[PDB]
Amino acid sequence: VQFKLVLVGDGGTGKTTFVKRHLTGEFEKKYVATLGVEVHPLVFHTNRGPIKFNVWDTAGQEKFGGLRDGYYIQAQCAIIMFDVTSRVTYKNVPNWHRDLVRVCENIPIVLCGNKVDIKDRKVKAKSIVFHRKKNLQYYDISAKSNYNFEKPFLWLARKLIGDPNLEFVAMPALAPPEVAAQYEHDLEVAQTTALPDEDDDL
Amino acid sequence: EEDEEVLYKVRAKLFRFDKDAKEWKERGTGDCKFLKNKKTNKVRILMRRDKTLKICANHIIAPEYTLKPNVGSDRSWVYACTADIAEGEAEAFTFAIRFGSKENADKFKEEFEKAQEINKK
Amino acid sequence: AMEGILDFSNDLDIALLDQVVSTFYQGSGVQQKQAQEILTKFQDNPDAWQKADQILQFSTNPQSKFIALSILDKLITRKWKLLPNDHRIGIRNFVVGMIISMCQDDEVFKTQKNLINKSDLTLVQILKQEWPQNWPEFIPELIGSSSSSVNVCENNMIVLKLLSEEVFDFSAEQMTQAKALHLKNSMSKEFEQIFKLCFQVLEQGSSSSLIVATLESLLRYLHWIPYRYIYETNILELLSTKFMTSPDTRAITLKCLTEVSNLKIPQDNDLIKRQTVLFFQNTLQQIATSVMPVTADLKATYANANGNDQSFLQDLAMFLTTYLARNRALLESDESLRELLLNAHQYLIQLSKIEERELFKTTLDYWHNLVADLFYEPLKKHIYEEICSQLRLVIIENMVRPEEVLVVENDEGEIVREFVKESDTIQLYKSEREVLVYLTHLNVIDTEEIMISKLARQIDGSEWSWHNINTLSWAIGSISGTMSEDTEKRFVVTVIKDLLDLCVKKSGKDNEAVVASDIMYVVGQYPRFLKAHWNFLRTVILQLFEFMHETHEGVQDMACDTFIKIVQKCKYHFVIQQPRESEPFIQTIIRDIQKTTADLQPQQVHTFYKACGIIISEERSVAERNRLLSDLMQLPNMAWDTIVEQSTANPTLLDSETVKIIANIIKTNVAVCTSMGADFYPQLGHIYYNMLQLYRAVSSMISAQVAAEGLIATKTPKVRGLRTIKKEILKLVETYISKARNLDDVVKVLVEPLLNAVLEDYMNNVPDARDAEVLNCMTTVVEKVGHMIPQGVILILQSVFECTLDMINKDFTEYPEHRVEFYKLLKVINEKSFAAFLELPPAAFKLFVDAICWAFKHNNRDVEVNGLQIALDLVKNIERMGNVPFANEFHKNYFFIFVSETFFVLTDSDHKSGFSKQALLLMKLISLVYDNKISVPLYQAEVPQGTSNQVYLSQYLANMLSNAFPHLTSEQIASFLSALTKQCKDLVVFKGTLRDFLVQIKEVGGDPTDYLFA
Ligand SMILES: *C1=CC(=O)O[C@@H](/C=C/C(=C\[C@H](C)C/C=C/C(C)=C/[C@@H](C)C(=O)[C@@H](C)[C@H](O)[C@@H](C)C/C(C)=C/C(=O)O)CC)[C@H]1C
Ligand SMILES: Nc1nc2c(ncn2[C@@H]2O[C@H](COP(=O)(O)OP(=O)(O)NP(=O)(O)O)[C@@H](O)[C@H]2O)c(=O)[nH]1
Ligand SMILES: [Cl-]
Ligand SMILES: [Cl-]
Ligand SMILES: [Cl-]
Ligand SMILES: [Cl-]
Ligand SMILES: [Cl-]
């Protein structure tokens, strides 16, 4: 049970950071532009079984676009990303959508306004209406704070499996096992590397 | 987790040290539970991410482990884990775990050490 | 192995290409990754287009052929006119031929839709270049070919849909103004024949893929076609009846009919009005008979999510809302149209019950539109009275949690404090409140009756639940202001009495938390009531104080917010001595402040103090106010006094507990200063000199720690704590100065010691120990008193300019806070104290210009915007000086630097956010030469004696563009510059010429006459 998901949107909107968060739990502070596309499998456990997304995280920078719409071929769902602190990224949403639906004529698509954690919001909530006529789902999200981060994948899962009452569930937890000079050096380096974002609530 | 008693639960953020890059990377935020197996009396750490409920920590609170402070925090502990199976096959990590307050951090350590004594029996 | 396709010295192994493509699309892991990189390299090879025909002919992998078409698309869009004519003819021929070939084979046409769609788009790219000037018979032959095959006819509809999109919907960013007009005019000129074909197909068929395709094309045409095509044909009848009956055409027809509801159409034409009524009438009849009756449970249907039901219901909402917002008046006067008007609205009522936030927002927008109209337009509200009454219920029952309500039910059924703010429901609540306020005004009796009886069913337990008491309490709170004070008085008394009843009977921490949250919300929403009922107000506040000792952290936190929310509006009643009270209540609050705030977290204590400040500033008698301020600050001042004693005895404060105490003392002062503003001065004066001494002491500790432990010291709890003291001191001074009314005291008492304490410390710390907050503090200092401290401003620049620039000029990312505050400071200095830059040594002034241009190149908006504003302000500053040596030298040294740097960011496709301000700056720069405002030659014998700066500017710019964009012709550059310089007094036109240039630089062979567009 696997589905091809294409992720599209302007450079710097947080596509790769969003995916990485889902993959490993981490939050990547640096902006390393995606080159063409990166494909990652991403599994969720649900009350209807596991669902596997093969996430095609595409490049938003025109100069790094690679195959561009060639990535969309046979996609079964999609996320269109923009950044609520950058109005141009919202203005470009119809362009991304155009290119996407020309290749993928009838797929479920989530529109996501990323970076809502940032105080100075520029794309006003009230302005976000493009999704309505296009039947896209919309969510405010933040890859940084995790605000609504699961929502796009839950909705897509529901649409793809065709079960509106589908929910994420806890993986059963197998009992863990009962298992040196370099350990000392490794731990020392760890202890003396500051933890990030020490001003956060957790 | 039906065969297990919840000895302790606390909200936490878990990191793993990437040694290649010299940085801490978040692995999950959510409830960190200490779980005692009712059949075997072994105590493990089991932690799950909020919302996705994916396991980000699953390992025995081995008696050999030692909680160490991080240089940047008065509300975190770092320790070497030799066998965590959150991702699948048993794997070694240097973990850091941070809490909402110093009080919570100190309570964790106390509970952590009690669980170590249980695991010793 | 796969890399072989990259070797163009050998024939292309097509089979190997298909393997690489298959590996990329169907493979995984490393193999997929390698194939991707190989394909991108193949695709980007500028000769790869020459393989396209071979691929199309010989490949057995549809994705290979797609990729071939992508390669051609890139060639067509960017290099078409660089091709020999034979290659243009050839490419057109095999694209056309492939399309024909694929349409004629039924299996291919059925199973290769993606590839045919891609082929069609590619054809459309050729049309954009070639049609109609070099392809005049494309449309007539398309029309003719349509009759020979159902597959071709259908595909022709796809081609025409894409052409309409590319010309009318997506041309603005992709074509020059002139080319866009050309193509729009061309499509307009032949649309009569296009429509004839469209209408014929729609007439002669019912429900098929050809019909769907035709309707898909119609949707696009409706964006721009003249309304006569819609209204003077039978097409509305077909759309609203026939095509609504079959489900596979229903979706697209409904979308077309929504767009028809937006067509530009005469307002004085009775027959057209009838037609507009008729299609709506037809459409609604089809819904009721073929889909679902008005009584259907759309909430249930949507939730079941069968087939395309969600999409359909979405599209229905869009149709009903769009049509009615424009046209409902057509249905309001004629008695025979009343049932239709009301049935349409009843469908909307049913749609508004669906659980789908975004859909709800769409319907709520419509309700807002309706009720706002009903509020004003005479004799209309009675028509909708039943609809509005149903709407009241829907809104009251679907109220989202207000931002103020800090408790929420967790997954285990426990009422707890929220983890985070629900940021994405802020706008939703405002929209709900807005509509409900209107609805209340429209019928206050109905609204009150609904609320008062719903509340009665909570008390007697018949409908009791957390959801129901919550939504109701939120709704009651939200309509504050809608009733007259007198009416409100009775309403609020009933509500509170009933909430207090609910409080007495529903026990347990969870229940109590829910009820407490709801009472706090309601009372905070009715200050007008509180003001008129002192006994009540006093008792509420005392109860909030009791909650400040709650073990329930959600209730505790909400008590603090509710306290200040009430105080913000009711402060006057706290400052005066009320009848039958022995003291003003502020005195009671202050006297017991230690007890009241004992269990609060520090930041909550600060909010409490801030609230007391609000009250104290109500006292306008200076003596009494200052005494109140003194009384309020008693505890922090006493803590302060004893720390100032211990600290000055010996720097060893090395105590973490002491650092926390100090930080909290300063935070408390910040909090009170925030609400008291100018009135805070006496308190500031009490601590000022010792506070600046403490800043110095703490600075020494930080430096010492870094020396002893290394940069890593800055991450430690101790050092972060010490810096918090510095930051909060800076914040306190910034806060006071930003609000100061006596600027003479600021300058004569505050500024000199401030600068002495902070500037050298900033300059002489290592980069990682410098606080950006210093820069922020100085901005406010310069903003408020800069005009009075010319030497102080110079001191500020000397201490922070060069050292901060060096921190931020190696990349765009390091020290992000310093970066932002740095340019804010430069901005206000350049605005208010330009003379400070005039005093800079030439080397430092060069760095200033460098700093400005560096700011241009940021993508970060906070920096970019200030950079462009500084540049513009600087040019104005210089211009204002007139014909003097400094201005003349500035132009000689920097005019072309600013022109070229502005051009660079305009043209590099990485700074599109700054377009408007870049254009403004460029226009200013050009207008200086155009208006002969530069008094010296901008050139050095380099050019003949008498040569005007106008002639030299063109020559410079032509040369710059020639070298920077060598693919442009000389005439392209010449024509662009002529238009641009001529238009340097008309920003909107000037901007259009810039946009046209940005289009032309992306392709070869741009028409130079395009720059004559007008
Ligand atoms: C249940 C348990 C709990 O611990 O706290 C409760 C929270 C109560 C809150 C506010 C209430 C409304 C404060 C009570 C005020 C009160 C009883 C004031 C009287 C002096 C008063 O004026 C009374 C007699 C009249 O009847 C009031 C109720 C209506 C008026 C003003 C009539 C009139 O003026 O004509 C939390 C903020 C709860 C969680
Ligand atoms: N504050 C904040 N920053 C974010 C968020 N999501 C991503 N970012 C930041 O924004 C930058 C860009 O992130 P990235 O994931 O590389 O964006 P992208 O859309 O993949 N770019 P590209 O299309 O070029 O590959 C990174 O520095 C990242 O840390 C967010 O939710 N909040
Ligand atoms: Cl795009
Ligand atoms: Cl294909
Ligand atoms: Cl006509
Ligand atoms: Cl008042
Ligand atoms: Cl020429």
Ligand SMILES: [Mg+2]
């Ligand atoms: Mg990316």
